[PDB]
Amino acid sequence: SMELLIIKERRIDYDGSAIRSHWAYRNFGILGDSLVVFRGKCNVKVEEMVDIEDLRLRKEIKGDDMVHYILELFWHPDILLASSLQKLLIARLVELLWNYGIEASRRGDDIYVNGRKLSISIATVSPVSIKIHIGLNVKTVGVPPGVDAIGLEELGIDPTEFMERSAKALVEEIEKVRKDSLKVRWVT
Amino acid sequence: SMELLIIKERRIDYDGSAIRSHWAYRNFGILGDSLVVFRGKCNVKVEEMVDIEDLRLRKEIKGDDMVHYILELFWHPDILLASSLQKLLIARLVELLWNYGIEASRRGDDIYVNGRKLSISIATVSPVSIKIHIGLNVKTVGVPPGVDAIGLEELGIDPTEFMERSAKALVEEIEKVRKDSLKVRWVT
Amino acid sequence: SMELLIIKERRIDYDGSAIRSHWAYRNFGILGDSLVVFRGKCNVKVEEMVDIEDLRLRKEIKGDDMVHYILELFWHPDILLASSLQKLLIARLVELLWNYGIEASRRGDDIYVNGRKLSISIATVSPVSIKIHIGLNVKTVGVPPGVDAIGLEELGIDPTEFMERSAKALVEEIEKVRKDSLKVRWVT
Amino acid sequence: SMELLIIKERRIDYDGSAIRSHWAYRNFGILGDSLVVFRGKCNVKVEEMVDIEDLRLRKEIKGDDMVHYILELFWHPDILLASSLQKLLIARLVELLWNYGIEASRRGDDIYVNGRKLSISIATVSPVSIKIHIGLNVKTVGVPPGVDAIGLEELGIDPTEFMERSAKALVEEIEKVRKDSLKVRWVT
Amino acid sequence: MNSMELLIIKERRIDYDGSAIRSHWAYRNFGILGDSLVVFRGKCNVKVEEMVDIEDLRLRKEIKGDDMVHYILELFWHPDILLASSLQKLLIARLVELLWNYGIEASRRGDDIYVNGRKLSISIATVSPVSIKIHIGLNVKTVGVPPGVDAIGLEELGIDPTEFMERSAKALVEEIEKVRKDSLKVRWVT
Amino acid sequence: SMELLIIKERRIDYDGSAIRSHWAYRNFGILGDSLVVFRGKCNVKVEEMVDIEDLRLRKEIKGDDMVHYILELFWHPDILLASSLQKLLIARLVELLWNYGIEASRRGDDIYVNGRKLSISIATVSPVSIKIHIGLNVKTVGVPPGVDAIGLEELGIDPTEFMERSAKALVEEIEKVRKDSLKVRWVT
């Protein structure tokens, strides 16, 4: 259906390199649609930056302890599809945070808690797939000053436990999207 | 941008045909991507039912008073995009219900409040567009026995005022989905 | 992956209407990609004829005992993809027949043995999916005047056993098509 | 109609670069859908390998005398289409081999004889086209040990003459795929 | 890349009631497979159930004429409405350029051809689940045309229907083939 | 709608890199469909020539003073759409020149005035958009010997005023293309 790989023992960093096509397959032998969830540092390299806006105003994307979500879908490489899914997934996370008594807020693809930004994300396409990245702060250390952040520990949430519950939630989200797309007749 | 039309004074019943392509243009001359919001009865004619499951199970889809959202997007007619978009929109309505002091939750594409179903929705495509319907009960009368439904009236929400506030939230969501798809470069 | 349903307990006739979108989901509740193999009569109503040339030559498509394969794939509805896939499937059946000691040959999408035609097939699309039909003559009773047919019975092949073995071959063919499509990088 | 260029006498080596877009037009001015068939060495450069599986087990793809087929189709750049069309072509070559009295069988995209692999192949897409490469061993020298190989010479087949007959059969295959795709009406 | 099909019906007249806009029309009726352009002459009386322009339906317009040159184009390309619309206006533009070689000061307003403020044509572009379908119609006479908009025909311009049909058909086929050839000789860009 | 940016203040040279995707957005902050018209020199680097026939003929694309039109549309990346649109725009310019009392003619995508070439143009796609460039000669100085060339100056057309009028006509043409595509029903 969809491959879920949660790297639970070691750690892996994110330099924006994992956004490329076939990243999950080339590095994990995971074939087709897949969600790879890991935890590590965050120092996106300029040459791997997808947001053309972050570049024009050379913004810096940093973090030390962040939870990473790498999604690759071999669907029609439509930028509108990538954008829609990304915000649907962020919205699922925002709702999930409420199970922990946390009042999250969504501003497009960004998640906010008590006015502070908890996440980062990007959605785009390759010539053969949809790639999406979601990042949730665990600790606010290493994050570039300007806007202020917040993380999972300060919110009283165990990361490894959140990775299990949230990865499951996102997979369910995507599978429901696929199933619903197959039970409806086209209309004139 | 996107066209928005909220019908506040007249009532319009939904028998399922509003789901057809070019409905907004044929009926009101609204050209291109549009969202039409109105209120009226709901009794979907078997010949107009989109969910094939619902036909298989001979199910009824009726309500005496419901707020309706008919969306047409002239994007690539992909069923997966239609499906994604549909749930992101429902998710936005749920987040909007929190601003009203309501603990609503989402179960795929259905809206729930205290174990009772508040909505109905369907998403599909025509040969030239994406079409989405979202129905929200105002009253509980006329709604088919099976699930326990709840309406906006019992939740103490003025339909007219909600239609305005939710319509603006849904249009804002779609336009952001669009702008975001335009600010990212493709990846290898 | 894909669902396979071989109707073994009873006969089902083909009037061409099984070529329509969501046929398998509507009649058997099978969601998504699917192959439904069954046995019955064949009498295509001019109403349901897909080959435009046949409608021109006012030809008849009938047979009293035929093995039917109805394939539906919810992939991009591309007529070229439907046509390529159809002929690959026909080619697989021709190779399979040699495993039974039969010398079959292919002429595009038609199978021949002893210069006689054994099959009929059609590949088209709906607004939401690819649809393919393959019919193999079990007996040559009820077949039209014009050209010689030959059926499995005459070839000494058991329909039941062949339905089982060919259905698995086709499903495996389609699965490999899908797997290979996911292990290759795009090129410049 | 499609373009065919057979390079019999001059030898062209294959290092994997011929798989890129516009290769045929760019080098020989052959515009549009085309099949170029030549002979030469094979030594695929790891930076030019399309199959990611091989990059994983970092295999080697080489031989000293191989018949090469480079196909480019400016159809919708769909990986599923590239994959299916590929396998239909490999299948047509197998059917051709039977005409030479060869007991050839297919295993996905590979041709075997006596349990030995006679070929290599790959199918992928560029942002503007479909590209397929089929390689047949003429001789087994230079080939890397692991899986046992076999060549056209050992089969007692004249390379040049096979090149002429095989190229023709492949072009005919693609042309029927196209014509069949234009004679069918779409279905509901 | 290679070619396309053309058929000019010179032996008789065929009336356009809008149903020729349907997919596989040329193949169903004339056996012409694939991309094609069919040119004929006859009356124009579009049935409301065959009308494609939704705006014509809303305004309840009559699409009539007693003598018109019809062009029915079908292209089995990606059934994209934007492609259909672009291509349709490129062809009307070519027809405009062509009238100049006949000494006519004609102009273009979208997909409509005008001469001295008077409308000479009608046209529509759309898609079917499997193809692009385009219709172009040029008044031969302005008889039978519903009153309102000032119409002009080929006769009043001193152009021979038959000869124009032949030259314009060739002009449109060449236009399409250059559109195809140009798409094939360009590399994609990052 | 569509963003139009006419650069009147300074000049900008075209080396061919402006044809890249998101050029207008990275350089001017213009998001979405856009037309950027500017004036400058034409010196196209071989590593950025798009017309492969130009590479094969080793042609030079030089000019000292030229009016440049760089169009980017985030529509389906269909090379046939790119091609079609490009020649429709060139046809508009040719029509526009008539209102200047000039006897212009069109040869595919090239504009002619008395057997002399006034323009250069290319149409292609990126993995996410359609990119077109139109170039009109202001002065025939710097253009390589070969085809008798011609410019705006010699036609007595003020570049600045023409840039203003031509730009509005192109934008206008693109909108009608869009609008017309939205008011038509699909056909069976």
- SS3 letters for C126-187? CCCCEEEEEEEECCCCCCCCCCCECCHHHHCCCHHHHHHHHHHHHHHHHHHHHHHCCCECCC
How far is Cα of residue B92 from the mean position of the Cα atoms in its chain? 11
The domain that contains D46 carries what CATH number? 3.30.930.10
Reported as half-sphere exposure (CB side, CA atoms, 13 A), residue D39 has a value of 17
Q: Which of D52, D56, D125 sits opposite A127 (nearest CB)?
A: D125
β-partners of residue E40 are E70
Residues 6+ apart with CB under 8 A from A155: A97, A100, A102, A113, A118
CB A111 within 8 A of CB A118: yes
The residue length of chain B stands at: 188
H or E segment and range at residue B163: helix B159-182
Chain A residues inside the 8 Å CB shell of B51: 183-184
Q: Do A77 and F25 touch (CB under 8 A)?
A: no
β-partners of residue D178 are none
CB B108 within 8 A of CB B79: no
Q: Which of D22, D74, D127 sits opposite F52 (nearest CB)?
A: D22
The shortest C-alpha distance from B158 to chain E (Å) reads 34
H or E segment and range at residue D81: helix D79-99
The span from the CA of A42 to the CA of A142, in Å, is 9
H or E segment and range at residue F105: strand F104-107
Residues 6+ apart with CB under 8 A from A118: A104, A111, A112, A136, A137, A149, A150, A151, A152, A155
The span from the CA of C67 to the CA of C128, in Å, is 26
Give per-residue burial for D132-160: e unless 16+ CB within 10 Å, then b: bbbbbbbbbeebeeeeebbbbebbebebe
Nearest CA among E92, E70, E72, E69 for reference residue E140: E69
The span from the CA of A46 to the CA of D159, in Å, is 51
CB E91 within 8 A of CB E175: yes
The span from the CA of B99 to the CA of B121, in Å, is 22
Q: Do F25 and A52 touch (CB under 8 A)?
A: yes
β-strand pairing of E121-128 with D34-43: unpaired
The dihedrals phi and psi of E100, each to the nearest 5 degrees, come to: -65, -35
What is the chain D residue with the closest CA to A31?
A: D53
Chain F residues inside the 8 Å CB shell of A79: 74, 128
Instruction: Report DSSP letters for chain E, one per residue.
Output: ----EEEE--SS---B-SGGGSTTHHHHHH---SSEEEEEEEEEE--TTT--BHHHHHHT---EEEEEEEEEEEE-S---HHHHHHHHHHHHHHHHHHHHTTT--EEEETTEEEETTEE-EEEEEEEETTEEEEEEEEESS-TTPPSSS-B--TTTTT--HHHHHHHHHHHHHHHHHHHHHHHHSB----
Nearest CA among B52, B75, B70 for reference residue B177: B75
Q: What Rg, from alpha-carbon coordinates, does chain B have?
A: 16
Instruction: For residue C103, give both structure tokens.
Output: 């010398």
Residue F2 has a CB neighbour count (10 Å cut-off) of: 16
The span from the CA of D174 to the CA of D180, in Å, is 10
The dihedrals phi and psi of E123, each to the nearest 5 degrees, come to: -165, 160
The dihedrals phi and psi of A94, each to the nearest 5 degrees, come to: -60, -40
From residue D93, alpha-carbon distances to D61, D98, D103 in Å are 21, 9, 12
Instruction: For residue A98, give both structure tokens.
Output: 């409420």
Instruction: For residue D37, give both structure tokens.
Output: 């068939």
Nearest CA among F23, F6, F25 for reference residue F15: F23
Instruction: For residue E151, give both structure tokens.
Output: 């119409």
Give per-residue burial for C165-188: e unless 16+ CB within 10 Å, then b: ebbebbbebbebbbebbbbbbbbe
Which of the residues F26, F48, F83 would you substitute to probe the E interface, choosing the one with the greatest number of E C-beta atoms within 10 Å?
F83
Instruction: For residue E52, give both structure tokens.
Output: 């494609």
CB D70 within 8 A of CB D19: yes
Residue whose pair of structure tokens reads 């939205």 in the numeric block: F182
Instruction: Report DSSP letters for A62-108, one per residue.
Output: EEEEEEEEEEEE-S---HHHHHHHHHHHHHHHHHHGGGGT--EEEET
What is the chain F residue with the closest CA to E108?
A: F95
Nearest CA among B150, F184, B145 for reference residue E128: F184
For residue E190, the one-letter residue type is T
From residue D42, alpha-carbon distances to D4, D45, D81, D132 in Å are 21, 10, 26, 15
The span from the CA of A122 to the CA of A131, in Å, is 8
Q: Which residues span the domain enclosing C98?
A: 1-188
For residue C84, the one-letter residue type is S
Q: Is E123 left (phi over 0), alpha (psi -120 to 50) or beta?
A: beta
Instruction: Report DSSP letters for B88-140, one per residue.
Output: HHHHHHHHHHHTTT---EEETTEEEETTEE-EEEEEEEETTEEEEEEEEESS-
CB A104 within 8 A of CB A111: yes
What is the chain F residue with the closest CA to B34?
A: F182
To 10 degrees, the CA torsion angle through E14, E19, E25, E29? Answer: -40
H or E segment and range at residue F63: strand F62-73
- Beta sheet of D3-7, edge-to-edge order: D3-7, D34-43, D62-73, D129-137, D119-126
Residues 6+ apart with CB under 8 A from A160: A8, A39
Residues 6+ apart with CB under 8 A from F10: none
Please indicate the experimental technique that yielded this structure.
X-ray
Q: Which of C25, C126, C186 sits opposite A127 (nearest CB)?
A: C186
* Direct distance between the N- and C-terminal alpha carbons of chain C, in angstroms, rounded to an integer: 29
H or E segment and range at residue A180: helix A159-180
Residue whose pair of structure tokens reads 């959202």 in the numeric block: B69
Residue window 25-54, chain D: list those with CB within 8 Å of chain C. 50-53
Q: Do E1 and D126 touch (CB under 8 A)?
A: no
How far is Cα of residue C54 from the mean position of the Cα atoms in its chain? 17
β-strand pairing of A3-6 with A34-43: parallel
The span from the CA of B37 to the CA of C170, in Å, is 48
Residues 6+ apart with CB under 8 A from F168: F4
Reported as half-sphere exposure (CB side, CA atoms, 13 A), residue C13 has a value of 10
Q: Do F52 and D127 touch (CB under 8 A)?
A: no
C50 SS3 class: coil
Instruction: For residue D11, give both structure tokens.
Output: 């030898």
Chain D residues inside the 8 Å CB shell of E78: 76
Number of domains comprising chain C: 1
Q: Helices D159-180 and D79-99, interaxial angle, to 10°? A: 130
For residue E158, the one-letter residue type is G
CB B15 within 8 A of CB B48: yes
What is the chain D residue with the closest CA to A22?
A: D52
CB C138 within 8 A of CB C67: yes
Residue window 109-128, chain A: list those with CB within 8 Å of chain B. 109, 122-127
B70 SS3 class: strand
Q: Do C183 and D82 touch (CB under 8 A)?
A: no
Chain A neighbours, 3+ Cβ pairs < 8 A? B, C, D, F
Residues 6+ apart with CB under 8 A from C71: C34, C35, C89, C130, C131, C132, C133, C134, C170, C174
The span from the CA of C142 to the CA of C23, in Å, is 26
Q: Do C26 and B79 touch (CB under 8 A)?
A: no
Nearest CA among C81, C178, C58, C69 for reference residue C121: C69
Chain E residues inside the 8 Å CB shell of C127: 129
Residue whose pair of structure tokens reads 């889809």 in the numeric block: B61
What's the longest Cα–Cα distance across chain B?
55
CB F187 within 8 A of CB E21: yes
Nearest CA among F16, A129, F125, F120 for reference residue E83: F125
β-strand pairing of A3-6 with B34-43: unpaired
Residue D74 sits at the chain F interface (C-beta within 8 Å): yes
F144 SS3 class: coil
The shortest C-alpha distance from E105 to chain C (Å) reads 43
